Amino acid sequence: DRVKKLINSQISLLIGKGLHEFDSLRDPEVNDFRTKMRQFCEEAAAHRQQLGWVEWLQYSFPLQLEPSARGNRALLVNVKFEGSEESFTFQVSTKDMPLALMACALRKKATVFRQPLVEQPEEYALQVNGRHEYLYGNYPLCHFQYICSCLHSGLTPHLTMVHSSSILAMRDEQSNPASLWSLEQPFSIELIEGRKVNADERMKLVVQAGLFHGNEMLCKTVSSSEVNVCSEPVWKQRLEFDISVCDLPRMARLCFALYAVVDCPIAWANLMLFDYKDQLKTGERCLYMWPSVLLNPAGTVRGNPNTESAAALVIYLPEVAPHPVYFPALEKILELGRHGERGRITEEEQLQLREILERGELYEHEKDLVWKMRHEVQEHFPEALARLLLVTKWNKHEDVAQMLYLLCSWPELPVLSALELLDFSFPDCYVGSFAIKSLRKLTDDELFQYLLQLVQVLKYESYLDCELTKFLLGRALANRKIGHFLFWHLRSEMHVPSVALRFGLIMEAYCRGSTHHMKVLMKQGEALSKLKALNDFVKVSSQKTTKPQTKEMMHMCMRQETYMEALSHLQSPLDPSTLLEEVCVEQCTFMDSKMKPLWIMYSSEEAGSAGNVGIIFKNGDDLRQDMLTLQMIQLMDVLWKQEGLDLRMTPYGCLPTGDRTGLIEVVLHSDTIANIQLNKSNMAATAAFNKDALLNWLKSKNPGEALDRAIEEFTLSCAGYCVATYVLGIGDRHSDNIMIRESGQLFHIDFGHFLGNRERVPFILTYDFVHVIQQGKTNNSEKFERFRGYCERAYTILRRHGLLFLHLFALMRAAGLPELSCSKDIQYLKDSLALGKTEEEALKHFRVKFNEALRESWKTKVN
Numbered sequence: 001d002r003v004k005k006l007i008n009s010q011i012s013l014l015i016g017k018g019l020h021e022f023d024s025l026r027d028p029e030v031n032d033f034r035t036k037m038r039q040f041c042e043e044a045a046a047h048r049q050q051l052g053w054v055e056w057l058q059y060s061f062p063l064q065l066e067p068s069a070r071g072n073r074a075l076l077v078n079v080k081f082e083g084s085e086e087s088f089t090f091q092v093s094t095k096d097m098p099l100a101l102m103a104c105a106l107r108k109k110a111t112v113f114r115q116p117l118v119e120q121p122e123e124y125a126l127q128v129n130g131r132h133e134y135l136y137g138n139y140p141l142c143h144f145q146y147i148c149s150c151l152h153s154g155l156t157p158h159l160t161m162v163h164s165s166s167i168l169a170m171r172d173e174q175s176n177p178a179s180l181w182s183l184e185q186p187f188s189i190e191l192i193e194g195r196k197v198n199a200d201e202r203m204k205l206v207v208q209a210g211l212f213h214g215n216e217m218l219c220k221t222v223s224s225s226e227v228n229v230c231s232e233p234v235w236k237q238r239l240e241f242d243i244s245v246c247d248l249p250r251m252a253r254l255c256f257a258l259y260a261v262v263d264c265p266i267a268w269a270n271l272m273l274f275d276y277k278d279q280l281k282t283g284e285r286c287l288y289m290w291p292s293v294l295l296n297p298a299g300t301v302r303g304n305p306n307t308e309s310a311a312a313l314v315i316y317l318p319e320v321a322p323h324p325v326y327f328p329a330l331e332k333i334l335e336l337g338r339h340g341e342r343g344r345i346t347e348e349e350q351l352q353l354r355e356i357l358e359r360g361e362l363y364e365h366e367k368d369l370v371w372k373m374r375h376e377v378q379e380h381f382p383e384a385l386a387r388l389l390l391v392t393k394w395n396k397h398e399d400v401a402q403m404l405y406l407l408c409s410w411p412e413l414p415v416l417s418a419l420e421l422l423d424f425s426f427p428d429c430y431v432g433s434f435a436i437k438s439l440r441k442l443t444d445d446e447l448f449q450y451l452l453q454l455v456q457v458l459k460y461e462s463y464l465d466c467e468l469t470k471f472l473l474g475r476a477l478a479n480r481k482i483g484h485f486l487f488w489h490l491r492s493e494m495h496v497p498s499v500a501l502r503f504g505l506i507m508e509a510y511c512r513g514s515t516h517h518m519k520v521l522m523k524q525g526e527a528l529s530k531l532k533a534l535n536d537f538v539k540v541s542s543q544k545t546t547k548p549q550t551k552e553m554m555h556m557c558m559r560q561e562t563y564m565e566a567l568s569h570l571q572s573p574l575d576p577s578t579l580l581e582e583v584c585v586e587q588c589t590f591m592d593s594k595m596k597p598l599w600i601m602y603s604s605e606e607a608g609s610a611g612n613v614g615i616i617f618k619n620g621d622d623l624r625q626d627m628l629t630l631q632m633i634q635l636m637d638v639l640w641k642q643e644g645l646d647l648r649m650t651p652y653g654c655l656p657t658g659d660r661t662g663l664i665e666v667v668l669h670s671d672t673i674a675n676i677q678l679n680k681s682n683m684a685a686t687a688a689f690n691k692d693a694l695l696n697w698l699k700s701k702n703p704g705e706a707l708d709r710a711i712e713e714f715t716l717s718c719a720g721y722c723v724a725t726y727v728l729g730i731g732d733r734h735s736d737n738i739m740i741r742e743s744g745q746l747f748h749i750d751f752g753h754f755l756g757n758r759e760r761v762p763f764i765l766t767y768d769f770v771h772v773i774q775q776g777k778t779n780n781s782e783k784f785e786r787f788r789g790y791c792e793r794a795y796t797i798l799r800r801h802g803l804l805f806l807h808l809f810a811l812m813r814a815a816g817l818p819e820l821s822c823s824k825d826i827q828y829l830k831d832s833l834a835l836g837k838t839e840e841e842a843l844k845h846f847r848v849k850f851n852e853a854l855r856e857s858w859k860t861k862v863n
């Protein structure tokens with residue numbers, strides 16, 4: 001009671017919505033979700049409380065491995081022991097396991113402390129200094145993301161030997177405190193009246209209505225009669241749909257659209273015909289409609305929360321029986337579908353099936369053949385499940401029972417196929433459950449890669465308690481990195497009234513499961529409060545006083561006790577492994593752009609060089625599209641690295657955290673092309689020609705022999721971003737949104753416009769980069785053509801995984817991004833990846849675009 005009331009107020013602050021509002025609804029669906037999901041999450045917290053010390057490391061500090069390891073050389077390593085400032089530098093091989101390194105550290109400890117030790121290497125974990133990152137398991141050193149980054153950057157790994165008893169003390173510290181088919185009457189509803197309708201009084205009001213099973217219409221859309229415009233329109237009329245009440249599928253939704261005629265659209269509404277407990281809905285309903293900016297089937301089945309102004313359509317769902325009618329059980333359904341005649345198929349008719357299954361829209365007579373051959377499909381082409389599901393007649397219960405009988409015997413599908421089955425175009429709760437079963441095999445690394453999309457799938461759900469929510473909640477409770485990000489993906493959409501109820505409930509369920517992680521997340525949101533307040537002080541001050549004056553005004557504001565306490569010693573929302581220890585106030589600043597984004601610098605004494613990190617607080621712009629583009633780029637880099645192609649990419653973090661608010665990870669020792677190209681006086685890189693400025697900057701940052709590898713880092717990262725921006729249609733590319741690292745790595749920032757946005761983005765080649773690739777020479781086709789090979793290679797690797805990109809982009813349509821909503825945007829990708837052509841055909845096409853970019857590049861060399 002004493003702690004439960006505090007935990008409840010902590011949860012409420014964390015999610016920015018009071019838990020009392022959930023109870024004020026008096027909603028049974030909400031209440032049952034809160035009881036059931038708190039049971040599931042506390043069970044998980046208890047399971048975690050007893051975990052072994054190595055399993056607790058797997059929960060808190062999951063391994064960050066290189067993509068090639070997933071599923072030789074000398075190396076200097078510095079190792080200290082927890083509780084001592086003394087350290088030991090020693091040489092190891094890139095192929096040695098952490099155990100060998102730990103055993104070597106223990107021998108070099110026994111020889112200094114003159115004592116034959118009791119502790120063994122098996123009792124220790126290697127922590128990365130000043131990070132929530134560990135090195136454990138049977139993997140060679142080079143296979144870890146930390147050691148791998150240290151070899152490229154030439155840096156020395158600094159590890160700490162943490163004992164098993166210390167790891168177990170962290171676990172203890174973070175403890176949680178103690179029958180339908182008989183009804184053959186046509187489906188009908190009574191459109192009674194409307195409220196708060198704001199429309200043109202010269203026009204008349206109409207109510208269109210469709211019956212949907214996801215994207216497909218169950219029957220033709222019906223329309224209401226015209227009634228003069230006013231705040232309270234009255235109809236009191238019965239609308240009949242060409243479908244039997246027995247034929248209505250389980251996941252069927254009634255979609256409404258209120259509009260004016262002489263074509264101004266006013267509002268929309270949806271609802272499920274079956275409630276969460278499978279009962280057919282009866283009685284009067286008040287539908288608080290959403291404003292339209294015609295019928296919207298993919299829209300939310302929950303009403304508009306603002307009842308103080310939303311227009312409300314009043315409907316009556318008739319009583320089709322004297323008793324409540326529930327949806328038949330799986331046992332009753334499987335028996336109907338179990339009986340299903342099998343006919344013999346011709347060998348000439350079997351050639352037509354194998355061709356269209358491997359070929360993708362179908363013709364009317366081909367669907368007839370796909371359905372007839374459903375049994376041969378299940379047993380020889382099980383990967384064609386989604387084609388068959390689309391040919392099934394969801395408005396004819398005999399077909400649906402027959403399909404579900406095959407589904408329950410269907411072999412498990414590869415992850416790529418399951419991702420397709422999560423699309424709104426497959427709304428059956430059993431299809432969704434078969435897809436989740438096939439996704440259970442996803443590794444925590446694959447899960448995390450597609451986590452963003454899986455969160456958008458939750459918006460397509462028809463009911464609060466679903467298999468996907470339980471799967472995502474179960475994975476978040478067993479891996480703290482997944483839990484961290486799943487929290488921030490939901491927390492960032494709390495300002496959207498259509499998703500606030502579901503996301504606030506899922507966040508509450510997680511907080512029951514991890515009380516310690518709630519405190520860690522609160523500390524992060526508290527920092528975000530102070531950052532918003534400090535960015536507001538800057539947004540105002542910057543437009544009166546000069547940039548250097550506003551900087552010391554910001555620095556004094558940051559030096560207040562409330563700021564110094566809130567902004568220090570927290571986990572980075574961008575990376576849970578990165579600890580943000582001491583704010584370096586004098587190092588902080590802000591951009592002179594419209595939204596004045598804050599650049600907050602941090603340092604750590606325990607972490608050293610790796611502890612010096614930056615975060616950019618952005619308020620005013622929507623960070624969702626950058627986050628998606630960056631994840632897509634990082635996916636391309638994982639795909640390329642899996643084929644042994646490392647193109648030296650820079651997928652920095654970017655996380656939306658609230659309404660037009662979010663963080664971006666600063667990439668240090670990097671500058672924009674525009675700033676290097678300023679060609680300033682008295683500095684190192686000043687050149688005779690501007691085409692040299694960038695190569696002279698690389699020359700000053702990488703002296704002598706370092707330059708040759710800096711040019712190769714540039715070439716590889718160039719080839720990678722040329723392909724990525726081409727495939728993704730990233731336009732609006734200029735010198736101020738292209739940055740380069742002191743290492744030679746080139747990268748892109750400011751991903752506001754992608755997928756052509758409506759024009760087709762060509763392949764781009766800047767001659768300023770071509771000059772760096774050619775090592776400052778006018779003609780160097782040896783180096784230039786290596787670059788063209790790196791490009792062709794990168795492009796062909798991505799095409800082999802084009803379906804993965806298409807399925808992921810299809811799931812992202814749920815997010816509501818203005819430049820990603822319909823098939824028109826997904827078309828840009830099929831064109832850029834040339835997915836309908838053969839490899840030699842698509843490479844030939846790609847070669848033409850690269851040559852066309854080269855002709856465009858010579859138009860600036862000749863000048």
Ligand SMILES: COc1ncc(C2=CCOCC2)cc1S(=O)(=O)Nc1ccnc(C)c1
Binds near residue numbers: 618737
């Ligand atoms: C879209 O906005 C951003 N995107 C990325 C960065 C980064 C920078 C350096 O490290 C990797 C991240 C920063 C921002 S920003 O600071 O909000 N905007 C900028 C616009 C143009 N030029 C600059 C230097 C910044």
